[PDB]
Amino acid sequence: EKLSEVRSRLKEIDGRLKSTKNEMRKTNFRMTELKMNVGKVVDTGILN
Amino acid sequence: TKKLQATIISTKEDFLRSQEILAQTHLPEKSVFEDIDIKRKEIINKEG
């Protein structure tokens, strides 16, 4: 039961780790969106 | 009218000069979009 309490603490921090992994994957998606935006066709030639 | 005839003669000379400049093709690279896609793949791979 001591082991159960400490491993439930472990699962809590794992869900916190999973939440951090979800945040990091969202940041990776956002940086992928940024690099997608950098490499986009430019339609300013007619404007110039 | 004489002034506009002189101006249109000058415009015809400018058009002939423009045609002489157009004799130089200065063709855009055939694979600019392909190079843009290649560098987008390269940056995505580098960030990955």
Identify residues after which chain B is interrupted (C–N over 2.5 A): none
Amino acid at A30: R
Experimental method: cryo-EM
What are the residues whose beta carbons fall under 8 Å from the beta carbon of A39, sequence distance 6 or more? Answer: B36, B39, B40, B43
Task: Tell me, rounded to whole angstroms, the distance of Cα B18 from its chain centroid.
Answer: 12
Task: Resolution in Å, one decimal, please.
Answer: 8.5
Return the closest-CA partner of residue A38 out of B47, B3, B25. Answer: B47
Alpha-carbon distance of B12 to B6, in angstroms, equals 10
Q: How far apart are CA B11 and CA B18, in angstroms?
A: 10
CA distances from B7 to A12, B16, B19 (A): 83, 14, 18
Structure tokens at A9: 């603490």
What's CA A3's distance to the chain center, in Å? 32
Is A32 an 8 Å CB contact of chain B?
Answer: yes
Tell me the C-alpha to C-alpha distance, in Å, between residue A48 and each of A7, A17, A37, A45. 64, 50, 21, 5
Q: Does A30 touch chain B (CB under 8 A)?
A: no
Instruction: Enumerate residues 6+ apart whose C-beta is below 8 A from B40.
Output: A35, A36, A39
CB contact under 8 A, B43 and A39: yes
Interchain pair A39, B47: CB under 8 A: no
